Fold this protein.
Amino acid sequence: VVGGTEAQRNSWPSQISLQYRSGSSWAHTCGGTLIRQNWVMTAAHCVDRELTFRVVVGEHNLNQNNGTEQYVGVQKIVVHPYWNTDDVAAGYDIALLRLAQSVTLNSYVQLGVLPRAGTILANNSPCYITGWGLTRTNGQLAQTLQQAYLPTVDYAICSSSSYWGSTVKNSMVCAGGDGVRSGCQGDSGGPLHCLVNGQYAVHGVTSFVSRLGCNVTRKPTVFTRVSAYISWINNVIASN
Ligand code: NA
């Protein structure tokens, strides 16, 4: 997250860190949202590589013992069947991870609530992106979980020619684009939390930013629209 602030450690208890085994250690690669005690929602592109993955719930500082973490292996990966890794702009950038164990819930570990199917946010709706992604274009991962306020940019604007044009689909949510605050590499797969009727819900799964940089004016961060995938999510969980 570029232009973020440090999150309070109990603000976003559904945020997870998706990590891969790297030598004798683990490296953060993506975010995700805990949606059942044994299921995480993330981006398909985060699990394109044939790596050994684990999820960390209750994580705050990637570089220090928080006293709250639970570490759990990924047992099964179900990518959306229409995902095509060389065409992110087509959409379908979503995957579910079944965890090897069911995590224990507490103030640091909660299920993300999802929007009702079909919900589309009005332009300029208030949301936060959260994650440990790069803090500058071509920078480094954050140590502590970051948040940035990114108001939505509706389809009509986001798919206009000075924004994303044809690359943004109605199955996506755009947020931000102010040139200061954005998602960045390593935030992929994590949540966009939007406040609706008094309650934050996870409306987005971080999918892409501009090849020209993270915080680029009129290139808002692009997310998979969770509300387009409610039936898919339920179908996967019920069949696994
Ligand atoms: Na930690």
